[PDB]
Design an enzyme around this catalytic site. Structure first.
Site, mmCIF file in Angstrom:
data_model
loop_
_atom_site.group_PDB
_atom_site.id
_atom_site.type_symbol
_atom_site.label_atom_id
_atom_site.label_comp_id
_atom_site.label_asym_id
_atom_site.label_seq_id
_atom_site.Cartn_x
_atom_site.Cartn_y
_atom_site.Cartn_z
ATOM 1 N N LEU A 44 -1.728 8.880 14.489
ATOM 2 C CA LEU A 44 -1.063 9.281 13.259
ATOM 3 C C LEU A 44 -1.978 9.979 12.265
ATOM 4 C CD1 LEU A 44 1.240 6.201 12.459
ATOM 5 C CD2 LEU A 44 1.898 8.410 13.433
ATOM 6 N N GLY A 45 -3.287 9.919 12.452
ATOM 7 C CA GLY A 45 -4.214 10.521 11.516
ATOM 8 C C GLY A 45 -5.578 9.888 11.627
ATOM 9 N N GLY A 65 -9.791 9.918 9.489
ATOM 10 C CA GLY A 65 -10.734 10.382 8.490
ATOM 11 C C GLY A 65 -12.156 10.033 8.878
ATOM 12 N N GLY A 89 -12.157 5.560 9.864
ATOM 13 C CA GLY A 89 -11.317 4.917 10.849
ATOM 14 C C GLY A 89 -10.241 5.878 11.313
ATOM 15 N N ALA A 99 5.256 4.159 8.049
ATOM 16 C CA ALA A 99 5.969 5.138 7.234
ATOM 17 C C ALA A 99 6.041 6.446 8.009
ATOM 18 C CB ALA A 99 5.273 5.341 5.887
ATOM 19 N N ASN A 136 2.075 11.149 4.260
ATOM 20 C CA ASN A 136 1.556 10.916 2.920
ATOM 21 C C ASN A 136 2.235 11.851 1.926
ATOM 22 O OD1 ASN A 136 -0.160 13.467 2.544
ATOM 23 N ND2 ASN A 136 -1.080 12.607 4.406
ATOM 24 N N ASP A 159 -8.547 4.496 -6.234
ATOM 25 C CA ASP A 159 -8.411 5.682 -5.397
ATOM 26 C C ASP A 159 -6.946 6.113 -5.356
ATOM 27 O OD1 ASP A 159 -9.156 7.792 -3.825
ATOM 28 O OD2 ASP A 159 -9.435 6.618 -1.992
ATOM 29 N N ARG A 203 -2.426 11.774 -1.714
ATOM 30 C CA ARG A 203 -2.730 11.564 -0.303
ATOM 31 C C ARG A 203 -2.768 10.088 0.077
ATOM 32 N NH1 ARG A 203 -7.163 12.919 -3.065
ATOM 33 N NH2 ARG A 203 -8.937 11.466 -3.006
ATOM 34 N N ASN A 204 -2.926 9.188 -0.894
ATOM 35 C CA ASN A 204 -2.959 7.754 -0.642
ATOM 36 C C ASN A 204 -1.608 7.088 -0.878
ATOM 37 O OD1 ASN A 204 -5.657 7.832 0.087
ATOM 38 N ND2 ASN A 204 -6.390 7.347 -1.981
ATOM 39 N N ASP A 230 -4.151 2.797 1.130
ATOM 40 C CA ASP A 230 -5.594 2.992 1.011
ATOM 41 C C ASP A 230 -6.228 2.041 0.005
ATOM 42 O OD1 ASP A 230 -6.918 5.790 2.327
ATOM 43 O OD2 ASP A 230 -4.728 5.637 2.320
HETATM 44 N N1 LIG Z 1 1.523 3.471 7.879
HETATM 45 C C1 LIG Z 1 1.264 4.870 8.179
HETATM 46 N N2 LIG Z 1 2.214 5.614 8.764
HETATM 47 C C2 LIG Z 1 2.009 6.921 9.058
HETATM 48 N N3 LIG Z 1 0.817 7.508 8.760
HETATM 49 C C3 LIG Z 1 -0.182 6.800 8.169
HETATM 50 C C4 LIG Z 1 0.025 5.440 7.861
HETATM 51 N N4 LIG Z 1 -1.094 4.993 7.296
HETATM 52 C C5 LIG Z 1 -1.985 5.981 7.231
HETATM 53 N N5 LIG Z 1 -1.464 7.096 7.755
HETATM 54 C C6 LIG Z 1 -2.078 8.345 7.868
HETATM 55 O O1 LIG Z 1 -3.283 8.281 8.731
HETATM 56 C C7 LIG Z 1 -4.186 9.276 8.121
HETATM 57 C C8 LIG Z 1 -5.538 8.705 7.983
HETATM 58 O O2 LIG Z 1 -5.461 7.415 7.429
HETATM 59 P P1 LIG Z 1 -6.219 7.105 6.042
HETATM 60 O O3 LIG Z 1 -5.361 7.559 4.889
HETATM 61 O O4 LIG Z 1 -6.460 5.612 5.926
HETATM 62 O O5 LIG Z 1 -7.619 7.859 6.043
HETATM 63 P P2 LIG Z 1 -8.303 8.376 4.703
HETATM 64 O O6 LIG Z 1 -7.332 9.227 3.936
HETATM 65 O O7 LIG Z 1 -8.736 7.152 3.828
HETATM 66 C C9 LIG Z 1 -9.793 9.375 5.140
HETATM 67 P P3 LIG Z 1 -9.783 11.032 4.324
HETATM 68 O O8 LIG Z 1 -9.259 10.922 2.921
HETATM 69 O O9 LIG Z 1 -11.248 11.595 4.291
HETATM 70 O O10 LIG Z 1 -8.884 12.015 5.145
HETATM 71 C C10 LIG Z 1 -3.640 9.656 6.825
HETATM 72 O O11 LIG Z 1 -3.209 11.016 6.830
HETATM 73 C C11 LIG Z 1 -2.522 8.815 6.574
HETATM 74 O O12 LIG Z 1 -1.487 9.579 5.931
HETATM 75 MG MG LIG Z 2 -5.683 8.497 2.347
#
Ligand SMILES: Nc1ncnc2c1ncn2[C@@H]1O[C@H](COP(=O)(O)OP(=O)(O)CP(=O)(O)O)[C@@H](O)[C@H]1O
Ligand SMILES: [Mg+2]
Length: 282
Positions: free
Chosen positions: A19-20, A22, A25, A99, A103, A144, A148-149, A162
């Site tokens: 799903l994504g 960074g 993780g 979800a 985001n 934070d 995006r969060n 987040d």
């Molecule tokens: N419950 C969920 N369902 C669908 N997508 C999800 C999710 N939880 C997290 N994601 C997505 O997984 C991706 C990465 O997760 P996360 O948001 O924790 O990394 P991050 O944003 O802290 C690192 P960075 O900001 O550098 O990209 C994000 O795009 C987020 O939208």
């Molecule tokens: Mg995020």
């Protein structure tokens, strides 16, 4: 270190597509049989946060600290919800609510699929003001808060996510002396940037920048200004301009959150009351 009330059997968990990702993780879609105690027979679609092959020592530690923080928050309508975890005998799996709309940033950018109306935008701001009110009540600072969060579910419910940088706060200000900070500069309050002080009012500042992100349909804060030049402009009283279609009542709300004096900014309780009145008359 097992916590039995949150431990989930690995056999009951089937991982799916990513799903994504960074630099802390990754998140994969998964199937969790009987994770919902309200319907203990049905398999629930969940999201699993986990480490990567190039993870570090801090990556593991941060994921553990985010897990403990989500245990203390509890369930709310506008907060992503911790469902369980796999900690014993294998990789750490943090199982949270799923979800399907992504985001909030990519969500709004994809509606400039569906189409966003003025009521939709105000509805977004109201739910995020309610999630922060319960979060502030639970003695937590998010540190934070950004578009995006925020996660959007299948039924268009805004979920705050987040919590890797979230901390617990008591009645005085949170304060640490750091070799260098880890908060995104464009969303930080002046006291957090200069004085290294974070309170619930600092989250109100981020909420204002969050409001600007929402009504720009996913724009970037302080457009055209680098992170390097933002330091001097905050000291001198610079603020962001009003979006294209944003009522002056809601821009004054942003300017309220963006007040220099933290105690002079509105509280999340007051933002919920004001947004409630604005939303019902639409
Ligand atoms: N419950 C969920 N369902 C669908 N997508 C999800 C999710 N939880 C997290 N994601 C997505 O997984 C991706 C990465 O997760 P996360 O948001 O924790 O990394 P991050 O944003 O802290 C690192 P960075 O900001 O550098 O990209 C994000 O795009 C987020 O939208
Ligand atoms: Mg995020």
């Amino acid at each position: 270190p097992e916590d039995p009330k949150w431990e989930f059997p690995r056999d009951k968990l089937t991982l799916g597509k990513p799903l994504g990702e960074g630099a802390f993780g990754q998140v994969v879609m998964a199937e969790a049989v009987g994770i919902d105690k309200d319907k203990p027979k049905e398999a629930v679609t969940v999201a699993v946060k986990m480490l990567k092959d190039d993870a570090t020592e801090k990556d593991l530690s941060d994921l553990v600290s985010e897990m403990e923080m989500m245990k203390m928050i509890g369930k709310h309508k506008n907060i992503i919800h911790l469902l369980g975890a796999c900690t014993q005998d294998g990789p750490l799996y943090v199982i949270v609510a799923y979800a399907s709309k992504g985001n909030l940033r990519e969500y709004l950018r994809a509606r400039r699929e569906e189409q966003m109306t003025f009521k939709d935008l105000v509805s977004c701001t109201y739910q995020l003001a309610r999630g922060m009110e319960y979060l502030a009540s639970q003695k937590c600072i998010h540190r934070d808060l950004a578009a995006r969060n925020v996660l959007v579910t299948e039924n268009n419910v805004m979920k705050i996510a987040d919590f890797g940088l979230a901390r617990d706060i008591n009645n005085i200000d949170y304060y640490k002396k750091t070799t260098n900070g880890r908060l995104p500069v464009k969303w930080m309050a002046p006291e957090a940037l200069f004085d290294r002080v974070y309170t619930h009012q600092s989250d109100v500042w981020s909420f204002g920048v969050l409001m600007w992100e929402i009504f720009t349909l996913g724009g970037s804060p302080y457009p055209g200004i680098p992170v390097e030049e933002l330091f001097k402009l905050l000291k001198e009283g610079h603020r962001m301009d009003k979006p294209a279609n944003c009522t002056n009542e809601l821009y004054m709300m942003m300017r309220d959150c963006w007040h220099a004096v933290p105690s002079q900014r509105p509280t999340f309780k007051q933002l919920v009351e004001d947004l409630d009145r604005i939303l019902t008359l639409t």
